[PDB]
Design a protein around this nucleic acid. Structure first.
Lengths: 156, 197, 106, 127, 183
RNA sequence: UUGGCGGAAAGGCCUUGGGUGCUUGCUGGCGAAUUGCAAUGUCAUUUUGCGUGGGGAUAAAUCAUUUGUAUACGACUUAGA
RNA sequence: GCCCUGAAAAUGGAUGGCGCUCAAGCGUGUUACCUAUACUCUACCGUCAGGGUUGAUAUGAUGCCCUGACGAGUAGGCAGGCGUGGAGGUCAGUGACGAAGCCUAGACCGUAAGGUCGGGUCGAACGGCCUCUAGUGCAGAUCUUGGUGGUAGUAGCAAAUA
RNA sequence: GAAAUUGUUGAAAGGGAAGGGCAUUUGAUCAGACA
């Protein structure tokens, strides 16, 4: 006998988890995030791109669109914490956003059916984009910080 | 904010400018100091000449060649004040000193570049009107610097060349303002003025 | 365009320290353009990344990144305190560092 | 497949070495307390080495646990190994250093059939 | 057998030893290091030139209070000597290794000293008579000398390893876009 | 490519002539997605090595010998196709 | 009140240094800021104290669990443990398919004393546990014996004519 | 066939000592687990 014995063997019965009183409540977005607001994406592949805020999905994320015809940003899902909400406003009360949900973006090249959904949504925005002058060129230009720019006093 | 900052040493105080530069060097900002012969020191000329003589007599007794080195150039006098404001015996303090260049007068290419001043180091902005001050170039010559006339001759030649450059620039700037004034009274000029431009 | 910068440049000054004792767990960062603690309040919680070059090829690139965050202000001149996932090598005193705009509160 | 355990905290990973153990060859590495009247280590001057104390004690829940999550139990034969058949999720069998090469082949064969994890399954193998 | 730490092919090498030789260990170490890595016939002519005071042996480690010479300029030193007794034992061992290589069947025009080692032998003890009726030691410092010669070979190596590299999910997409977009 | 200036560490600056590319000064038409909710997302120059091939160049020093204006030894000063 | 004279010591030197003159000096006031092994909160270790818990079919009642407070220290006292030689009992323990020893900026466990494993070397015995026993743990004693360095290829090997 | 001490080889560092503590970079090396 190299080692005699442990005088008491610990029990291998795993105890159940206690009742967790941490029920989940819906997210409270900041007051600057109203649907129709022009957003600036800070992280990701479309960083610096300017998009249009459409819907607040149930997974605490935001449903956005470029539009895809303007700057090449399709119907996409982004987090609210990586987004600077600007002051430019576009009336989103002509759009069918209620169809899109969390299960819509399921991984399971580009699937064909979502292409026409992008074309049926962008037509309802480019109609009003042409109302305010220079908005279409604004939405196709990437945001960037220049020398001397101070974000703590820059009005967005 | 800039890759290399060129500070004009004329009208500055050797101690208040060195403390500004020493902090900038430790933060990783390259500093070039020009015209170190026109630095100012508070107090009369006889005060600073006596203070340097007190420093001059401090040397190692058994070997003068390994004691305190009393540099006479105005650039090195400013360097000595700056060296004691930095922990120069450590690796971090040595790397900070390689980010600094101090010259008498305005040397080459730093003569074709913009020179700045440190507002909290100007003699005119810190000293009471009436206080006596000493010029570093005159003090250095009295303690053994023999290049005051060479720098003054080269500086006079540089100012002639820079005056000719400014005449071309001032004439070109007036031509630019005439075209910018004609750019007014238009649609794009009035729209810019509405947006603060 | 000519510039694609979505961050603000900062400088690693030193660790949180007393006269003779330092704490490497907290680093002091000087953000350019900031000179008051009130302006430094905007940068609280913003993500900090230090970009440096290495020699050995790791994942098809010679650039390794050390991440951190702004925790609180420090002093009356806009200096902020920073805690990284791993402490800075202390050889970067005066090296440039990047402070991003996310997580954004605007 | 160990039991669920909390995160293992050591509070000290460096070895406690004697004062001047790197200064003299005659001073061993096994820790000895300084009894000197003028010792800077005994008086706890800052910048010196740290002395072991009861504050460095590991958590009782995670004490004696390997990084895999089991407790090391020395095993010399099959009968010693058969004391852990009902305790495979808490103890891991370790073969003694003096076990012959042919006797270990039986040990790994028996441990595999019982689901007992062996911490040193490569010792003295004719690979 | 069982020489020092070598890192050469034994099938293309020849060796020789000398044990308990009554030569200075400090002088022999300097002589051995002077021909380390040298070609065999090149080192034999150099050792013979030491006896004629035409070239010197650079003293590098055991050189305290050694007089200067102009012949150390070749080796970049100022302190060198001519250990004639050390050279004869070293050159007497080089011709033995050269004879062993001929017996094995190696080419003498490619041999070079790939390994040479000198370490202390058991000391031979004598005694000295000092002032006030005191006796001190007069010990010798003998040497164990071993050296290996090796044939020089070309075509060193190639095709080392594979260098496994890990990739992320998002970064590979734009690398696939490096050819999708550009060339 | 033309011409001029610049020696304080010039090694930079100004300028002529055409060639070519871009132009968001203005009006358009297509392309971006799947890198799937953030992971610097690589974009510097530094030296050295190694091969392709477009030009150029075709030496010395040291030891040894010798000298004594030198010299403890090195060094120094000389000489010798 | 401040400043100056009074006010002279021997290596070169000390508001800590640089330096500072509407001070970065002095007197005084208002705030902001820097952080000690101090305070507050939380986790863990140990100690102490107060309690809960022998129901049967499970393993430790010197056990498990709950709660609170506390933690400096020489001379010194006490307690709990680690290690060594030998002895009784036990593991029908390990081993020539390699015991003991030794080497190993290789690994694991313990706050630590130490224990364990892998690899190399090695060749014949050795270990865990429950108890007993002692010629039982070293860095020092101008310690003892033995061995080896720096100094060092150094001092030197120059009387007695060659 | 240990240590002091020494040689060779390999690696690293070195501007009037060296060695140590806390923290991280870099290099080397090791580990863990695939419902």
């Amino acid at each position: 006998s190299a080692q005699k014995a442990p005088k008491w063997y610990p029990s291998e019965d795993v105890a159940a988890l206690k009742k967790t009183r941490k029920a989940a409540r819906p997210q409270k977005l900041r007051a600057s995030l109203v649907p129709g607001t022009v957003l600036i994406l800070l992280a990701g592949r479309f960083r610096g791109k300017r998009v249009v805020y459409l819907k607040h999905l149930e997974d605490n994320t935001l449903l956005i669109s470029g539009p895809f015809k303007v700057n090449g940003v399709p119907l996409r899902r982004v987090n609210a914490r990586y987004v600077i909400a600007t002051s430019t406003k576009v009336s989103v009360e002509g759009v069918n956003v209620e169809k899109f949900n969390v299960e819509y973006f399921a991984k399971e090249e580009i699937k064909a059916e979502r292409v026409e959904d992008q074309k049926v949504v962008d037509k309802a925005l480019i109609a009003e984009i042409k109302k305010t002058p220079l908005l279409k060129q604004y939405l196709s230009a990437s945001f960037s910080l220049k020398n001397g720019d101070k974000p703590h006093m820059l009005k967005f | 904010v800039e890759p290399v900052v060129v500070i004009d040493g004329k009208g500055h105080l050797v101690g208040r400018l060195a403390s500004v530069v020493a902090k900038q060097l430790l933060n990783g900002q390259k500093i070039v100091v020009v015209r170190a012969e026109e630095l100012n020191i508070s107090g009369e000329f006889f005060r600073n000449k006596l203070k340097y003589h007190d420093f001059l007599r401090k040397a190692t007794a058994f070997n003068k060649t390994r004691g305190p080195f009393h540099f006479r150039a105005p650039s090195r006098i400013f360097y000595k004040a700056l060296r004691g404001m930095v922990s120069h015996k450590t690796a971090r303090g040595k790397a900070a000193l390689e980010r600094l260049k101090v010259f008498e007068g305005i040397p080459p290419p730093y003569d074709k570049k913009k020179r700045v001043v440190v507002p909290q180091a100007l003699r005119v902005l810190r000293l009471k009107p009436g206080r006596k001050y000493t010029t570093l170039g005159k003090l250095s010559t009295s303690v053994g610097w023999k290049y005051e006339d060479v720098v003054a001759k080269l500086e006079a030649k540089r100012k002639v060349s820079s005056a000719e450059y400014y005449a071309k620039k001032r004439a070109f700037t007036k031509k630019v303002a005439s075209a910018n004034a004609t750019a007014a009274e238009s649609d794009v000029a009035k729209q810019l003025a509405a947006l603060g431009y | 365009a000519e510039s694609h910068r979505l961050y603000v440049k900062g400088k690693h000054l030193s660790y949180q320290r007393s006269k003779r004792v330092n704490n490497p767990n907290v680093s002091l960062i000087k953000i350019e353009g900031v000179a008051t603690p009130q302006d430094a309040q905007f940068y609280l919680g913003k993500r900090i990344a230090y970009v440096y070059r290495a020699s050995k090829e790791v994942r098809g690139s010679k650039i390794r990144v050390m991440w951190g965050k702004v925790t609180r202000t420090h002093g009356n001149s806009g200096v902020v305190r920073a805690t990284f996932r791993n402490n800075l090598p202390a050889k970067t005193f005066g090296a440039s560092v990047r402070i991003f705009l996310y997580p954004s509160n605007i | 497949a160990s039991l669920p355990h909390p995160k293992i905290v050591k509070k000290h990973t460096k070895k406690f070495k004697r004062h001047h153990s790197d200064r003299y060859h005659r001073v061993a590495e096994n820790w000895r307390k300084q009894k000197g009247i003028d010792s800077v280590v005994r008086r706890r001057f800052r910048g010196n080495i740290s002395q072991p104390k009861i504050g460095y004690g590991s958590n009782k829940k995670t004490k004696f646990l390997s990084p895999s999550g089991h407790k090391t139990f020395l095993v010399a034969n099959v009968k010693d190994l058969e004391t852990l058949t009902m305790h495979t999720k808490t103890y891991a069998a370790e073969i003694a250093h003096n076990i012959s090469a042919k006797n270990r082949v039986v040990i790994l064969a028996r441990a595999k059939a019982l689901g007992i994890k062996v911490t040193n399954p490569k010792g003295r193998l004719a690979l | 057998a069982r020489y020092g730490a070598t890192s050469t092919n034994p099938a293309k090498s020849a060796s020789a030893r000398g044990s308990y030789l009554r030569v200075s260990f400090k002088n022999t170490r300097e002589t051995a290091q002077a021909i380390n890595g040298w070609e065999l016939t090149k080192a034999q002519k150099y050792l013979e030139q030491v006896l004629d005071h035409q070239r010197a042996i650079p003293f590098r480690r055991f050189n305290s209070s050694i007089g200067r010479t102009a012949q150390g300029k070749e080796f970049g030193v100022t302190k060198a000597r001519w250990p004639a007794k050390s050279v004869k034992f070293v050159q007497g061992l080089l011709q033995n290794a050269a004879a062993n290589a001929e017996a094995k069947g190696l080419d003498a025009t490619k041999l070079y000293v790939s390994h040479i080692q000198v370490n202390q032998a058991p000391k031979q003890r004598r005694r000295t008579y000092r002032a006030h009726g005191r006796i001190n030691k007069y010990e010798s410092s003998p040497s164990h000398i071993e050296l290996v010669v090796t044939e020089k070979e070309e075509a060193v190596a190639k095709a080392a390893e594979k260098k496994v590299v890990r990739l992320t999910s998002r970064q590979r997409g734009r690398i696939a876009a490096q050819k999708r977009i550009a060339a």
